[PDB]
Amino acid sequence: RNPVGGARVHFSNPEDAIEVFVDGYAVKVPKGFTVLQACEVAGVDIPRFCYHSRLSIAGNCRMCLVEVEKSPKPVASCAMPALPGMKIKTDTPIAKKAREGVMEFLLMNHPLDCPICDQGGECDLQDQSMAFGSDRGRFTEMKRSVVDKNLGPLVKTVMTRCIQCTRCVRFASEVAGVQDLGILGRGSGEEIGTYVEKLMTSELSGNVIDICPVGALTSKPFAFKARNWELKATETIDVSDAVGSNIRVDSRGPEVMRIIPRLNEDINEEWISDKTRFCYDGLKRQRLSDPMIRDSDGRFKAVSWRDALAVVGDIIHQVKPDEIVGVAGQLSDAESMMVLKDFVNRMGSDNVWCEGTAAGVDADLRYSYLMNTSISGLENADLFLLIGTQPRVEAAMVNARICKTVRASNAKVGYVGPPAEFNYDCKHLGTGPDTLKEIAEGRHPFCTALKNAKNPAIIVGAGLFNRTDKNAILSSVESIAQANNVVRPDWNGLNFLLQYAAQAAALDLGLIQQSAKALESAKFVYLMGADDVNVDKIPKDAFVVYQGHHGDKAVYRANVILPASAFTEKEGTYENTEGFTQQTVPAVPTVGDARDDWKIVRALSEVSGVKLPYNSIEGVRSRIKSVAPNLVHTDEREPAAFGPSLKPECKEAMSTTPFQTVVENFYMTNSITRASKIMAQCSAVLLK
Amino acid sequence: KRGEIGKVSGIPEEHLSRKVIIYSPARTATQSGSGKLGKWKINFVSTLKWENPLMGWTSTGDPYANVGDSALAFDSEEAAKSFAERHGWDYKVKKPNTPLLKVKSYSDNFKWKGNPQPE
Amino acid sequence: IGVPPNSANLTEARRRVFDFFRAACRSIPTIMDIYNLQDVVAPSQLRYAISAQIRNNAHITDPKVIDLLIFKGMEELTDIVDHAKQRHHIIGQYVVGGKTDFLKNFYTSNYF
Amino acid sequence: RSKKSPMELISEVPPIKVDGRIVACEGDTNPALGHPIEFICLDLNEPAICKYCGLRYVQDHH
Amino acid sequence: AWRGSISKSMKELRILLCQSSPASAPTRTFVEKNYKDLKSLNPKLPILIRECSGVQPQMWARYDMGVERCVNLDGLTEPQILKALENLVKSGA
Amino acid sequence: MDNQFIFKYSWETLPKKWVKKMERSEHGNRFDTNTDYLFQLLCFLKLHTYTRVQVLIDICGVDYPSRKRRFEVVYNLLSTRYNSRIRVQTSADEVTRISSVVSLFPSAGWWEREVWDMFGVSFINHPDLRRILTDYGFEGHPLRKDFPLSGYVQVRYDDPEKRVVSEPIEMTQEFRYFDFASPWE
Ligand SMILES: CCCCCCCCCCCC(=O)SCCNC(=O)CCNC(=O)[C@H](O)C(C)(C)COP(=O)(O)O
Ligand code: SF4
Ligand code: SF4
Ligand code: FES
């Protein structure tokens, strides 16, 4: 037989493996597993309400009670450790009668509001009541009730339906790191709440909607909109940040209803951030849908695809080859970036780069812009040194795993950068390059812990790449990495954290800026979804073409607007901060007369008298295979090949300006969230 | 692809050149049960839908709008791959993401912090 | 009469293909009279149409698949012989018939 | 009075005075002809709204 | 002295290889013992080293306008790889 | 006469190489045989004195896309003399021809034509195997699991063409599939 849900049991050694009899079947489990986990290995799925595999054990609900031969009373299988030779019994009358008793107690004060509950067709309480519960209720007295409390603009609260499993409290205390929710009171009158009118300000606060087994905690924007049985589930990835969390887009027709997490033990581990969860609102607002060209007076008129392409192809032949600049956006996929690079190269230019970390970064060796330690590999680190990075706002899930490691392995975190708020205890070593200089030479008290740590982990932020002293800072970081051993064959510690979903693919494909002063001396700028660049930098004589799906400040400057499809409407490959390549699956139809980015660039190349060998998405991926062949071997764990020793010696001077913060508004980062209605009211009341 | 069964089946040649995804749907995040797992499905990527300009209903022109979600289900990846191979569909396989059972104990909630260190 | 037993080799499949093709050829005059195809199509354009269908299904090497194809073709021929199908249907199926394909498809719609 | 939407019509019904801290709303005089029983806690200052009927209940004395 | 004019003629040098194979081992040796020298002599040339599992050892070179030339480094030694790079640098542009 | 007696008698009397699976239950005594022994088994079960099965109730196909032999053909049989029912099943894929039983049971012709129409299974020695239910010129076998519920083509009247024509299907409101499956099943 196979474990429930295809769960993989990792046996550290064959010696430490006890044997249990779940239902007369011999089961081998490691020492430390509980009765519930042993049953899960044996294909038996025990009912549960308060137990979560990512939260600490708390045997409240008493729903997982089973029978054990050497036990006078039923044991809570979620908390009872498995012993060698133990005989578990799950389908016996004792465990049954216990399950109906517990269900009868749970459904005693529960409100009769299944029809209006947003957990209607997806509730564990009623699903288990049908299966493991009884048929008739013996309760006739008056039920209890509680008032509802405001937890913010994201979590809708109806605590009359609370079953008091305390999963939200445990999540807030352990995973989120923001202790603001707790069980208040004693007895049947105990309630979940924050006591003082306050709102859930955690970037992971939206995950309490999922961990709640009942409709007590539900999404406020996705309130009453639809039922779960009406929604088609698409397994897609994230593009808001460079973590690339695995999500599940649910849609009802041509619009996206909601986004919920998807299991991935190596990237997100069942959680997503609020920005990921509530970015679907912007996909249906201010969407560009028709090609548009400015008029003589200065107004945009809707134009067919043929005429817009004709205009841009006619203007592209009137500018000098080095006058052409193509800038890719943060949401761009690898194929379209490759097509854009080919198009600009054939025209005689070499100025192609991405929105963010594209100031001249050397992408020559691929360990200098990737998390050489996997995200899941950060759990083995003993000391984190965050050099000018704020993972809480940049890569919120990497912050989640850092908090997990700190609260479990008692790791130490040393932070070097601008003042910020952390959900774990951190030591503020400094605020600028002088701190790195102090660390490198030694005698700093944190250097003792750095050199006395078995598995240190240095994490450098992507914002450290736009500075003028980038080479000096990278050299000093590598000197720290070499002197205090962090890069070894058995453990790699040097990490670089990117902020944009397209940065890893752009650096892999060679999309690196050549001339720093290239956007001021340009005459044809092709803003391929790049609305996060300063449009005031572009000269007033330049012909700016904006290719995107949302209207932003770049639209007010563009001369031609070419509508494009969002990440939920196309097949594209994105690379994580760790170099892991994933693909998005289309979920909803493209709105209006908008086309895929690579299609638009290919059509423009054809109209501009430039032939491109590929004509389909399969042809482009063959071209990528000759540039970055790891962007087509999707879902493969390929580690870095070389180390920091190959970089040439660079004796520059490190500057004195303190590090800046790259994300000011966590809820306003890309164009989709910038056009969303939920993110506006989130940044209006949740940000301080 | 030896799509001979596709030729002797009756599917029109236009729909025999579709690109499909073979995958195993994962457990929903809002429920802890693991009953709807282990089955493999063929995703036809049928996204071409619009809105009826009389009542707002969702219109479609794709015959494979819900076949893979409603009727076409397989018990293994090999079965779905063989089906796609015989029907001549260009397929790609997405391996499912499975949980890893780690050691968790109730006593870990109550762990000694250590001797008070005046560091 | 009865459906023939399944073939055992490719030679039998080829023989049945030739027999079915000859049967369709003998069926040509009857269609010219049941439907007013006299001043419509030459008596050899249809023959070329069946030849082209056989030739573009000629990459099959499985005798069972060939037998099923022959059976379906014979069923279609029997249906056409009867007045079951409408007149324009056979004329809609049995008639023999600049920048870039990609750019025209791009101008048409996003879904290729 | 078709110009009044149901929201405005239910916003004009004065709240029902209840002496206790909790009231059970069924939606009609005959229980079988109303909505499922709903117990509403009157421990706030604003009137408490039934999630089925829209009727508002306010505590009488304290 | 051809190692000092690589950036003058070329515009990008990609060296595809595999990190776990016995066919790309001379390519790995060439990268290890020559990347620092070439990069030091040509600070602005983007010498990209990209590796995957099922990849044959190659060596690409973009030129003035999209022109690319590739050499299969599958049966060459390290001096042979260096000579192939010399041919790309010299005869290419 | 009964499931307990028919099971034992057919276990003893029947040749062993014919049947390869025998279920004895209250839902029905089934026999599973190879497609090359179906006709022999039914001829035996139609003529034997203690198993006088003289009524063929119906022939139905079942589609199992996950199996190598995709289609399951079920023969529901009735014995009026002994007041008993017997079910015989075989398995065939899309490109094998199974033997026809019209020789033994004359009524089998229409159910065999319906099975061929609905699933695409061909029968050897069938006097006339042509579609019986679907429209003239129908392409595809609707009762297969991979066949879309609404089909591929649609029918409407074309005024310029002055005849009823067939066009690719285009629904004004698509079929909404509701997933009611529970994870605690
Ligand atoms: C109005 C009339 C109505 C009916 C018209 C007919 C409609 C259906 C047409 C039949 C459709 C089919 O695929 S039925 C026929 C399909 N069967 C085959 O194609 C066999 C494989 N072909 C070969 O073996 C050789 O290429 C061969 C071509 C034999 C010769 O070449 P040689 O001998 O050198 O080997
Ligand atoms: S939480 Fe579940 S059982 Fe309670 S009202 Fe909502 S759907 Fe019904
Ligand atoms: S609000 Fe939900 S998660 Fe929190 S204790 Fe109540 S039922 Fe559990
Ligand atoms: S799941 Fe074990 S007592 Fe609640």
Ligand SMILES: [Zn+2]
């Ligand atoms: Zn009410």
